[PDB]
Amino acid sequence: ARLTTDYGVKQTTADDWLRIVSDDKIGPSLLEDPFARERIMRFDHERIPERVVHARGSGAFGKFKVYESASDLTMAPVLTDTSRETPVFVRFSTVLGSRGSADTVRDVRGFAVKFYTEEGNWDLVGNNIPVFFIQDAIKFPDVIHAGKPEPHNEVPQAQSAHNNFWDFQFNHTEATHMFTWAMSDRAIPRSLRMMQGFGVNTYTLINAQGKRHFVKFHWTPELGVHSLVWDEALKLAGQDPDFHRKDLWEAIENGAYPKWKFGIQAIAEEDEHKFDFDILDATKIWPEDLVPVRYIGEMELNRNPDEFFPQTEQIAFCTSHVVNGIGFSDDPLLQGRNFSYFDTQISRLGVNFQELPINRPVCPVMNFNRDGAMRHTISRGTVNYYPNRFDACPPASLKEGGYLEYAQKVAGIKARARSAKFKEHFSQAQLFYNSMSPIEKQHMINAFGFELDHCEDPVVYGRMVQRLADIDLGLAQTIAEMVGGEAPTTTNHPNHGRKTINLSQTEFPPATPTIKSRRVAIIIADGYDNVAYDAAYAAISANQAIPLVIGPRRSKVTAANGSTVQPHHHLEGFRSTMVDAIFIPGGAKAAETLSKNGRALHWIREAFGHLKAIGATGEAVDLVAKAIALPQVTVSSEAEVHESYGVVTLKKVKPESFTDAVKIAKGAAGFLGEFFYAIAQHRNWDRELDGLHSMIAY
Amino acid sequence: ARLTTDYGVKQTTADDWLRIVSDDKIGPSLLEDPFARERIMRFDHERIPERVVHARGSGAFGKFKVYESASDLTMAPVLTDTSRETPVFVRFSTVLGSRGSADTVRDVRGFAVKFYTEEGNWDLVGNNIPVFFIQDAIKFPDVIHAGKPEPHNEVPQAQSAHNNFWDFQFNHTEATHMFTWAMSDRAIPRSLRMMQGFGVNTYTLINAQGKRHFVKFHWTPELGVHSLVWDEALKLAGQDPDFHRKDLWEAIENGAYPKWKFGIQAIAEEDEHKFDFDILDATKIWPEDLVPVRYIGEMELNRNPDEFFPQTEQIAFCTSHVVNGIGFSDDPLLQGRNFSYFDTQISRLGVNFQELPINRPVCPVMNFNRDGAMRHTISRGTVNYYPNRFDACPPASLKEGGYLEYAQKVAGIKARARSAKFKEHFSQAQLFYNSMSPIEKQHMINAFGFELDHCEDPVVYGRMVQRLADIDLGLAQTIAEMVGGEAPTTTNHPNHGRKTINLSQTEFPPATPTIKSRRVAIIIADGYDNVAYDAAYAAISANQAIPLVIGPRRSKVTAANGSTVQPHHHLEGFRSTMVDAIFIPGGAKAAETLSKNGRALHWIREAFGHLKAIGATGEAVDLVAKAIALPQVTVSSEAEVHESYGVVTLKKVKPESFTDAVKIAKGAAGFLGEFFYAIAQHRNWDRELDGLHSMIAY
Amino acid sequence: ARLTTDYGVKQTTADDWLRIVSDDKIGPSLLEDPFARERIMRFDHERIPERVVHARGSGAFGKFKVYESASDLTMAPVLTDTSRETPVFVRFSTVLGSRGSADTVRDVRGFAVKFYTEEGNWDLVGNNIPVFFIQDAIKFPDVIHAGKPEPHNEVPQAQSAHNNFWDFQFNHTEATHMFTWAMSDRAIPRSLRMMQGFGVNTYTLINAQGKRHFVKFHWTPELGVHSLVWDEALKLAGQDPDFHRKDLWEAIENGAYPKWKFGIQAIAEEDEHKFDFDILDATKIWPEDLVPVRYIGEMELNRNPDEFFPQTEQIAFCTSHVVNGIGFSDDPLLQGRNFSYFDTQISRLGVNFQELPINRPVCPVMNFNRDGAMRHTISRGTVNYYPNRFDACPPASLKEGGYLEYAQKVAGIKARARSAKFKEHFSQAQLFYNSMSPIEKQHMINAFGFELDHCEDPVVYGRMVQRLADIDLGLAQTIAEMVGGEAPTTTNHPNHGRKTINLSQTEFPPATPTIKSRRV
Ligand code: HDD
Ligand code: HDD
Ligand code: HDD
């Protein structure tokens, strides 16, 4: 392999333009040089427009397969064939930010899946939140413009924390349910692999008998639903803007393929109008206590892209992409969406976007669509229209797999309006808030407090405080004292206190106790205990977790016994925000050095403040106890394992200390068991519920 | 094969949009319909920008091979390997007209060849005229804008016959030589298969020893150089705007692959400054009496495109495309061209145009050029720059085929100017006019007369008449009496009368006497002589010519003997302008009917006026004689074959009449032989030289 | 004012698509609706390609004026007229990051100024660092690709802290001087209003007598040169990615218009070859102890944009934009740059980009350039070429202000190579490091330590440790103990210890003691 021009001509150098030159005097560059001009021209035109929304995203290839046929609901083979595996590509994303914005901002997350079925491409373009801000697609530009950077100065980037966003939220009551979800932990996921996915809009399924069902699609992570805490999310946005992109890529590269269970909620054609809300209203969820989610399949991502730009950046999804057996409903949000995903590709990619490798279906494509810019397809023949004398490219009958258009009855008048049930805008917002656990309510309170603090206009946060009273009077009062304004004492939308299942993240734990893919920092310094170090390192690895050694330097650290190791990073190059938990082995010399290292003390205080599991043995126990300096947090004093607020310690290490079985469960006996259990729980919420984090500086 | 969307979903119909409908009442179309929107969207975006120049063109695939190695001049394998065949695609075109303009207008013709060599793509982007209007590329917009439709009203289409064109010709004397060629028969070729091709600019060749030669490339048709006459060219422009496109496609489909000999003119590096003119001046030819053309190869076109748009419309050529062993010179016209063919593709096709099938090289392409709109190429790897730690994609040394940049010495100052010899602008214009045969001079005179007649501004044609005196005083006078103005009696640029070889088309006859691919109309009517008909039809076919039967109707025509035939076209659907010659068999009843048919009489008079061969036997002889009504044109009276001005007749057909050998040569004995000889001569110029065409109304 | 379509038809609502509907049942949306389709279509096509480099940036309007005529160096009125004020628009930016990336990352900062002079638009497209990574423009794609997110996974965003960047730095020694500047505090400015600006390449000035001078342009902040500290810069990148954009907008809105002094370094045509380095080598600075900076003007930014997208996002600069009296040199980096700023606009904006309000000159434009996509200009007349019979749009003579092309002598051969003096790649890197104050050296050490820590390939940081020995042996040892690798004990490029003036930020304090614009 040797350097060539794009037209195949080999070149002798990639370092000099053709110019006039002499040993002692340089001259002008020549216009004639085709190699140089081509290099610069290709470079000059590398960029294409970013997606108008969901510009920041990461994707991977995978496979989908149903383990239970849904033939009773649909005749689409992708959902009925339990023997075939369907290839997919999934792109996750944020919504408001442009291409270089951070992964860990507070925002809705896109969850788009392209199913390359034998019957054509089916795209399920969803989000990690089940509802949306608006009921009619016509207002998408309004809500997006309001959330995006303000027009005069293009501030702020990838943030809803500003005047215009909250101005729209207050003035468009349809969005009430949505901004409640937006302030919940759902909007700051720990990993794209640890969040749900939803079709959001109401679609339809048609079976072999022609019977139709209205449906909602669900994706549920087998690792469970987990989130970051705000201070941590903001730090990561700067310290590692690629946190989620790297998290996904790393897991797949390590063989920890993320999986999701695929479920369907179905309502028979005949029961369309049997609910208090309109089942086609995208600002409404279908309470699972009324319509259960039926899980029938599983999807896993098992292969990273070969090259990001031609694949992840150029992939195009659209709600318009449906295969036989799957259809649309009169959902007024979905209806306008179909128009958009085709239209936008014209300028973002080009009219022939379906020819791009990543977008092409895996089955035969036959039609008379022709030409267009950058056309690669060459079609032989003298005819390009139907009907024609050769009966070339005839339509497919229904029996041959032709798309079945449900003959839905339609009656009414042409008008710019929605039906009666769409007028209800507060009930589910209250239901959602009511269903949140205490810690989740606290996080939402902190979110409103931060967001409205960043609204400079007293009219904006003042009005929002009034609106919050329509969700919960107590909530309004708390926010009012935090950001200003006056919380009303009454409301025309009383909160009756009902709650529902499967809304709180507490109802989505991992399929089984695990710490798979979690990152655990092992903090050391010269003189560390090689014994505790070796035990933890092996146990972390053997439990599919990632051990990351952090030391004062990234060259060499010497253990108390003389053995050495090269840490992965030094204390200044990384931060606790980047890991799931920290472990510090003993060694008097090491503990003393770390106790005088401000950066190290911060690692401990921050990990504590961010509610992460902390484990320490030997002399490191006193290090942690003194770093935290909280009487509420007790530690081991002898050879007994001790746990307090997710802080696991063992001061006196004995021969049996690391011989106990490693059981990831409540009330484990050994040190590693209890430590891993704290990690498996993701975060220690009691630490925050008891206000301990508020006492620490991090 | 069944109808599907571009994303692979089978459809049941291509005739109805999804709408609200009932048996007796139709309703509105639905926005949700993805199949219909995709159909219309693809259609809405089918067009791409036409080429800014040479927009109207036709192309085909073929092969090239040298039969004599030019290793003494270059080490480029494409010009030294006599055992390999190099695939090529050639696109011919006009210059000024937009996409739907006519093939047979008066204009320079493009002759672009893309050589898909094993060492990369080499493009020889030439024209059918050896020189150009300007010396510096910076003025291309000026000459093109002047010739193109005038800006205020966009008139006229594909014509140099208007004020602005001739305004520029007069004011920019560098163009004198060129407009002389433009008014010659070279600008109205009979077929793209019957014209020469030239690189025009001076290129360079470098051999294995590193020695360089300045060169000119030539393409010479084996069918010879032939042209149409003006009245005919204009009629065809309307009657069949695709005349040349069809001519090329038909010949190839019929197995008559057009061929050209490839030749090179070479001047040693050391003799660069040994001529009166600058050898890098594109407004100058290298007189073949001074520098002979060395023919070393042959190219043939043998395959029509599979689909016009993705291939012929999207192919991109550029002077920048050169392979090792071939280089550029300081030709100030060529220098700027190199910049243009890359630049223009950005908007016409797209930055990734080299990825299109038709443009891709046939050898490996390896470099770090990346991304860009509509990117199909996927490159695995973590590096995309040089130098890199994996030494990925290193440059090729000269021994490995790396492009050799000649270390040409350069000395002077930075300035917007040309050197001394470039200042000569009239000598070769005179040489060209002097070298033209009498008939060619007459055709040029008629051209200037027609072109200037179409110039509304007295200042424009008035000045041009003055300029013509700088070419030939007699020419100026003749044009002045034809279009107005006052021809000067003197000139500061005397024409010394010298002539040179290989300029007149008379010096480019076919490789051997032939009528291959020529079209011959056989005009009949009920009662025609089946004998003469059968004889001519078989002889035409057996000599690789195309017999086209033309009758009063296109259903059935009955011969005098009762046999029948269905003509290819009726008299009103075709015209003599579309064929090379006409033949009319006998049959008293047929001749009588045709003698009273105005359209038929016109076929004869027009064929005569356009100088085409006319053959007739039996009763058709009197038909032709009376249709032409010229004493100067004599015809057979007995059983003897008679020829007069390309009109071949035989009044009394005998058993031996069609048993003579068919010899295409001067003074043949048989009727078919003499008739075919007249056809092989292309046109009868004596007919025009003696003013016989002027006596006929057609 | 009432809601209308783009074609002027008033609408009754912006909340509902036209559909089939009844009091109790909603129906499908109608295809016929032009108002709704137009709303969504305009929205669907709002975005245009971001700049291939310097995608993240912020700008403002201002004015420039020379207080001392430089007529001895040039006859360009913008630099000789002390009575006129020249309007300008300035866009500041980072280099590697895409549009939504953070303001406070470690990176070179772009400092582009468009001068709307009466004699045409003059753009001075500079950076906040005086030198560059490469000597020949042909390698721009290499250094940019190396620094940008790696191709397979598009990681990391707006950071030089990764394998490929440091792989290129080590392997292309021309970049040694540059990466030293990149690790200094210059790459993490506290404010765009507190950093210098440099033309970087060597330009030329021609006076009324036709005499030429080779020059370097300088912008020096009156508030002084100040920087953030790393931990702070990283936190801000997440806590307020618009920190610099807001800093600039706020200051201007509050009436604290940022100012810069404009200076010129000039070398007479005759002394072109009198230095150890080639004066046209962009990897070299002209030591101010050898060639002093002559300050002659001042520029201030005093007005924020009316709308970011049509102005700040769409503005196009190019080194090709020079007015009479200002020209180019054979600087092999500048030479290729001229080609690029015109070419890239074709896909980023469109061929008629010069018609956009923000790009249009303030003086008459007359030529025969025509058509092109989205053409707004309408030209009356039947002629569009030169020469023509009406002598329409004739050229301007030199006395009439026509651009003066210096008749520079040129002699040599056509070849892909640079001259002798370009071969020196380490001297100034050492000079720069030597000139840094103790605190600045410490910050650079911390930078190398952080950057190389983020290089996963032992070969990458291992080689860089070896390269650092060519700058300073002590530096290499310190970095080696911080990130790994083995610091060599010797070097073929000894550091002689010489220092020079005006490199350390300590030599650029505010014009006068102040806390103006500071937040407390
Ligand atoms: C009619 C306009 C409209 C409406 C009402 C919505 N969107 Fe949308 N969306 C677009 C118009 C759009 C778009 C402008 O057409 C985008 C960006 C560019 C593109 O390719 O598609 C897009 C992309 C886009 C993506 C990114 C696909 C990718 O990764 O490329 C996701 C995940 C969603 N949308 C999700 C949703 C959800 C869950 C919605 C609420 C039910 C929603 N969108 C309503
Ligand atoms: C610098 C500008 C310039 C100059 C001085 C010329 N041309 Fe050119 N030509 C172009 C700029 C151009 C172009 C604008 O770049 C075109 C049209 C679009 C395209 O692809 O290439 C083109 C196309 C084009 C084609 C058509 C290739 C095809 O079939 O696509 C031919 C045959 C020529 N040119 C021939 C010539 C000859 C024989 C010239 C005189 C020696 C000449 N051109 C001078
Ligand atoms: C030949 C390629 C090339 C080279 C060698 C450089 N650049 Fe460049 N630069 C471009 C090719 C480019 C570009 C690709 O054409 C850009 C981005 C898109 C655009 O409009 O211009 C650009 C933009 C760009 C901008 C942003 C203008 C804005 O705000 O829009 C600045 C400040 C610079 N460059 C500064 C420099 C400096 C100080 C350089 C070293 C002396 C340099 N560039 C070398």
Side-chain angles (χ1 to χ4, degrees), chain B residues 272-574:
Chain B
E272 189 189 319
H273 302 114
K274 280 65 175 304
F275 301 76
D276 288 358
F277 52 92
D278 195 295
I279 68 171
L280 306 185
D281 181 353
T283 61
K284 304 286 183 299
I285 58 170
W286 290 0
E288 289 181 50
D289 65 84
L290 294 176
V291 190
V293 173
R294 169 185 168 189
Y295 290 97
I296 67 175
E298 185 181 62
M299 172 187 78
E300 78 166 12
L301 294 180
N302 56 32
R303 178 164 71 79
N304 288 314
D306 290 310
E307 194 185 359
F308 191 101
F309 181 81
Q311 297 181 305
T312 308
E313 187 59 24
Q314 289 189 144
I315 189 167
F317 304 84
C318 207
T319 54
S320 286
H321 292 157
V322 292
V323 294
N324 186 41
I326 306 182
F328 311 113
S329 73
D330 290 331
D331 178 324
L333 188 56
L334 175 63
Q335 290 281 300
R337 290 187 69 194
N338 280 194
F339 169 82
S340 188
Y341 305 85
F342 278 1
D343 176 49
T344 198
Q345 317 300 350
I346 299 172
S347 63
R348 187 169 80 81
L349 304 174
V351 70
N352 273 305
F353 71 96
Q354 300 276 207
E355 283 193 333
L356 300 177
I358 195 74
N359 295 323
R360 295 189 303 224
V362 296
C363 59
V365 170
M366 179 74 270
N367 59 51
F368 293 121
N369 293 340
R370 294 285 184 277
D371 307 352
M374 297 299 289
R375 177 70 164 175
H376 280 232
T377 304
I378 294 174
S379 308
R380 292 178 298 104
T382 63
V383 169
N384 56 352
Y385 56 86
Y386 195 82
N388 58 76
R389 61 197 188 288
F390 305 98
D391 194 49
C393 192
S397 64
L398 289 174
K399 302 307 84 184
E400 301 180 311
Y403 189 85
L404 176 57
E405 293 287 353
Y406 189 71
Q408 183 194 298
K409 293 182 179 180
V410 172
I413 59 171
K414 294 187 178 183
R416 291 182 183 286
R418 278 149 286 161
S419 48
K421 294 183 181 175
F422 280 86
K423 296 181 181 177
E424 204 291 307
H425 305 164
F426 305 83
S427 183
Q428 299 206 337
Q430 304 173 330
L431 180 69
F432 180 80
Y433 185 73
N434 290 169
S435 305
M436 293 299 101
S437 66
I439 190 65
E440 288 172 295
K441 281 192 176 69
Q442 181 60 63
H443 288 171
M444 286 174 63
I445 284 171
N446 302 331
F448 279 115
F450 176 98
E451 294 273 317
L452 299 183
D453 171 86
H454 286 209
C455 288
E456 287 168 44
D457 193 348
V459 172
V460 174
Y461 62 70
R463 288 294 177 185
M464 275 306 307
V465 163
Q466 303 188 316
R467 173 65 69 251
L468 291 177
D470 297 326
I471 296 176
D472 185 283
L473 289 171
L475 174 60
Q477 177 64 40
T478 300
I479 299 306
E481 42 189 62
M482 287 174 75
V483 311
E486 198 178 72
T489 301
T490 66
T491 172
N492 293 303
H493 304 292
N495 180 161
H496 301 302
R498 296 292 310 274
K499 306 179 176 184
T500 187
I501 62 174
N502 298 328
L503 292 190
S504 166
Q505 291 178 202
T506 62
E507 288 178 59
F508 296 93
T512 189
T514 182
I515 63 170
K516 177 182 290 189
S517 81
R518 301 282 178 163
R519 301 189 178 84
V520 183
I522 299 176
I523 305 176
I524 63 179
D526 292 325
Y528 67 97
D529 173 28
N530 71 303
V531 180
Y533 173 95
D534 287 346
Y537 201 113
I540 290 164
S541 300
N543 285 258
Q544 298 63 58
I546 297 67
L548 289 174
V549 182
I550 310 296
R553 69 190 75 78
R554 215 279 299 285
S555 56
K556 178 193 297 179
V557 178
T558 302
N561 86 151
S563 58
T564 68
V565 62
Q566 188 199 1
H568 291 282
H569 302 278
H570 51 65
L571 291 163
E572 293 303 326
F574 244 53

Side-chain angles (χ1 to χ4, degrees), chain A residues 15 19 33 39 44-46 99 136 139 142 145 154 157 245 340 343 347 416 554-555, chain C residues 15 19 33 39 44-46 99 136 139 142 145 154 157 242 245 340 343 347 416 481-482:
Chain A
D15 310 332
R19 65 170 54 80
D33 194 343
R39 274 205 106 197
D44 288 346
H45 303 288
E46 289 183 9
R99 291 196 88 261
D136 194 313
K139 296 202 70 62
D142 297 303
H145 279 184
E154 202 192 34
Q157 178 68 208
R245 178 171 293 174
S340 187
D343 175 50
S347 64
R416 293 183 181 284
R554 214 280 298 284
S555 57
Chain C
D15 310 332
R19 65 170 54 80
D33 194 343
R39 274 205 106 197
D44 288 346
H45 303 288
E46 289 183 9
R99 291 196 88 261
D136 194 313
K139 296 202 70 62
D142 297 303
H145 279 184
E154 202 192 34
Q157 178 68 208
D242 302 293
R245 178 171 293 174
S340 187
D343 175 50
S347 64
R416 293 183 181 284
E481 43 189 60
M482 288 174 74

Side-chain angles (χ1 to χ4, degrees), chain B residues 57-77:
Chain B
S58 305
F61 286 99
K63 61 184 179 180
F64 170 84
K65 182 176 180 172
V66 290
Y67 50 74
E68 185 190 309
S69 174
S71 60
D72 56 305
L73 298 176
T74 183
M75 36 72 175

Side-chain angles (χ1 to χ4, degrees), chain C residues 217-503:
Chain C
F217 295 118
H218 299 242
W219 290 113
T220 301
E222 283 171 45
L223 280 170
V225 180
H226 308 288
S227 310
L228 302 168
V229 290
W230 196 233
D231 180 70
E232 166 191 35
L234 280 179
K235 277 163 175 171
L236 282 175
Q239 294 164 171
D240 192 345
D242 302 293
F243 189 72
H244 283 164
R245 178 171 293 174
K246 289 163 69 177
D247 171 271
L248 179 59
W249 189 285
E250 176 181 310
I252 291 175
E253 198 62 47
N254 291 343
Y257 308 145
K259 300 179 179 59
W260 285 263
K261 298 189 305 177
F262 179 70
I264 299 172
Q265 277 182 298
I267 293 178
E269 188 69 38
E270 58 169 51
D271 308 313
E272 189 189 318
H273 304 111
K274 280 65 175 303
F275 300 75
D276 289 356
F277 52 92
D278 195 293
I279 67 170
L280 307 184
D281 179 356
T283 63
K284 305 284 185 299
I285 59 171
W286 291 359
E288 288 180 50
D289 65 84
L290 293 175
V291 189
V293 173
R294 170 186 167 187
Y295 291 97
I296 67 174
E298 185 182 62
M299 173 187 76
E300 77 168 13
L301 295 180
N302 55 32
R303 178 165 72 79
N304 289 312
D306 289 310
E307 194 185 358
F308 190 102
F309 181 82
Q311 301 180 302
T312 308
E313 188 57 25
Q314 291 191 142
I315 190 170
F317 304 85
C318 207
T319 54
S320 287
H321 290 158
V322 292
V323 295
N324 187 43
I326 306 180
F328 312 113
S329 74
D330 289 332
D331 178 326
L333 187 58
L334 174 62
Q335 291 276 301
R337 291 187 69 194
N338 283 195
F339 170 82
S340 187
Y341 304 86
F342 278 1
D343 175 50
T344 198
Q345 317 304 348
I346 299 173
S347 64
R348 186 170 79 83
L349 302 176
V351 70
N352 273 304
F353 72 95
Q354 299 277 207
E355 284 193 331
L356 299 178
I358 195 71
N359 295 322
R360 297 189 302 224
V362 295
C363 59
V365 171
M366 178 74 270
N367 59 50
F368 290 123
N369 294 337
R370 295 286 183 276
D371 307 351
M374 297 299 288
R375 177 69 164 176
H376 280 231
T377 304
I378 293 172
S379 308
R380 292 178 298 104
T382 65
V383 169
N384 56 353
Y385 56 86
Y386 195 82
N388 59 74
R389 60 195 187 289
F390 305 98
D391 194 49
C393 192
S397 63
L398 289 175
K399 302 305 85 185
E400 300 180 311
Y403 189 85
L404 176 59
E405 293 289 352
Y406 189 73
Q408 182 194 299
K409 291 182 181 179
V410 172
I413 57 170
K414 293 187 179 183
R416 293 183 181 284
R418 279 148 285 161
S419 51
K421 294 180 180 177
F422 281 85
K423 296 182 181 177
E424 203 292 306
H425 308 160
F426 305 84
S427 182
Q428 300 206 337
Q430 304 172 329
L431 180 70
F432 180 82
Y433 185 73
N434 290 172
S435 303
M436 293 300 99
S437 65
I439 189 64
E440 288 172 295
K441 282 191 175 70
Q442 181 60 61
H443 288 170
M444 286 172 65
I445 284 170
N446 302 332
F448 279 117
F450 177 97
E451 294 274 317
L452 299 182
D453 170 87
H454 286 208
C455 287
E456 288 167 43
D457 192 348
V459 172
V460 173
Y461 62 70
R463 288 293 177 186
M464 274 306 305
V465 164
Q466 303 188 317
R467 173 66 70 253
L468 291 177
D470 298 325
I471 296 177
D472 184 284
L473 289 172
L475 175 59
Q477 179 59 47
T478 300
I479 299 306
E481 43 189 60
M482 288 174 74
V483 312
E486 198 178 72
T489 305
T490 65
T491 172
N492 293 303
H493 304 291
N495 181 158
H496 301 301
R498 294 294 307 277
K499 305 178 176 183
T500 188
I501 62 172
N502 299 329
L503 291 189

